[PDB]
Subunit: 117 residues, 6 copies
């Protein structure tokens, strides 16, 4: 009934393979992505934390490193790297290392994002 | 399971008619409104999208074009143009042409708003 | 269902008493905190408001005045003033004087927060 | 050289009377304006300030009063309330009571502004 | 004197060819770029403007459409697309069509940019 | 010529000890500060940079680690930690190790700050 969240940003290149022929999103293009990891459980009586942040950064780092300053399409499972797919992919990578993960949000621009539960 | 949202902003004038006599919100005034449209449903296996963003831009244009750089009180329904009523009004114009709309959020200033579901 | 929310910022010092000895969060430090108060209920058909912002500002001021330009550890209950605890603590001061309160959000930095419902 | 700046926002209705017939700016609209007041001068060796802020807030207050939650065009000197006009008008009102003011910046939208000196 | 500025954002891929072997910036990556164009000139007595905003949108359009949703390295003059080269290149495409232009600010990420001229 | 800027944030405590009896700024308090370092110089013909953004972090690291998650009053030179004094103090710590530094900006809150050259 308490939730935490943490934002990270990464710089990346991608393109959408399944859009019609002219579409601007089929060009190779890039963005400053924002990812929000959201976490839900009990507040620890001694530490007063649901989770240490240094834990959360450590458990995300392997996945973060694959995304940042990379080309998304070269990453297995991101063959079609829209926000929807990216956020599912991210959940799939993070959830088995962060059991208390309750949601992933991805934002490609400042005016548009996607949330996966 | 998956949600998407898209943010727009318009510049309009409004004033509240039902506040007490000298209240600042009863004077002719303006804001940079932000509106957020939230969509929920199935991710298409092939496009990797819930909805094309261009369908949405197009289905909101007419309602948008009515709000932007206008005086709100002169639009039928926006007689009492608080944030609450305005989010409800946008939902009401928008839900018929975007069946997957799951929420409307209105912000009048950067420090306050309202969400209608 | 309609939800309102208002955002406030205060400047404050704190430190965490229960982290291990090296840790940077055990040092005397501070932040620009953000508290989001969120309210749920019925829109008044006459005023077009779930609540008047003036009643909200007035009901939170006592709590705000305690938090702002202060050292958080010196407030009873905020002895371990993390986000999770800061937010439960704000809910307990505010729920009694704002019965439609539905959530409290606290952010310490721009990239990390906590929500209590 | 040392410079201070302070940012204020106000909400306000306006319209531009000298744009052509169709033009959307010639329709009654509003924005959330941002004004930045910039001040240059000696730092006092004892207080470490160029100026007390409360002395800037109090010296701006009467100009800020006339602008916040008002229709700009009713204000003499603002009959044509473009950004360039509105920043030169604020300097004309503030400069006499803050003789260290060195610039005034007005923004109407988050992406556009104007600087007068 | 008076100064105007207008901000644009474009989404794009690039990478640096002249950085050391392993350097992250030599991978294909991208950013959400910010470009600020700054204009300096006389305010016209009758319109109250330095320059019509959409006279400026229309004049940046061909330079903008080439940068947006594109791969910076394919464009002639941007074979080494650093901030500093980007900014001067934007200058060189725009200056000839916007005589009053007085500065180009390019930003690659929220916390880093460069100003030419 | 060309200017680079890079922004950093740190989380600190302070209090001013030279303000009158009651003043809110004389109480132990904190902010999320922001510091912009600004650098001016030749763009290198081959690298297309003025300075390497990595040589800047390394040279600033020792100063940033003294300010971050600390109480500013304990640091010599910051006896009276106003924005103005702090900006000047950052200049004096950084200029010897970054000779192309041309300005330092400090922001205590999102709505106020100070530039030193
Ligand atoms: Zn994209
Ligand atoms: Zn209003
Ligand atoms: Zn802290
Ligand atoms: Zn306008
Ligand atoms: Zn880059
Ligand atoms: Zn302070």
């Amino acid at each position: 009934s308490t939730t935490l969240f943490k934002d990270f940003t990464f710089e990346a290149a991608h393109r959408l393979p399944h859009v019609p022929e002219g579409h601007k999103c089929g060009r190779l293009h890039g963005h400053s992505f924002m990812v929000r990891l959201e976490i839900t459980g009990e507040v620890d009586p001694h530490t007063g934390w649901i989770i240490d942040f240094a834990e959360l950064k450590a458990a995300f780092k392997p996945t973060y490193e694959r995304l940042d300053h990379h080309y998304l399409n070269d990453i297995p499972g991101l063959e079609n790297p829209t926000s929807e797919v990216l956020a599912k992919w991210i959940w799939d990578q993070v959830k088995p290392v962060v059991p208390l993960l309750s949601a992933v949000m991805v934002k490609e621009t400042c005016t548009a994002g996607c949330i996966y539960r």
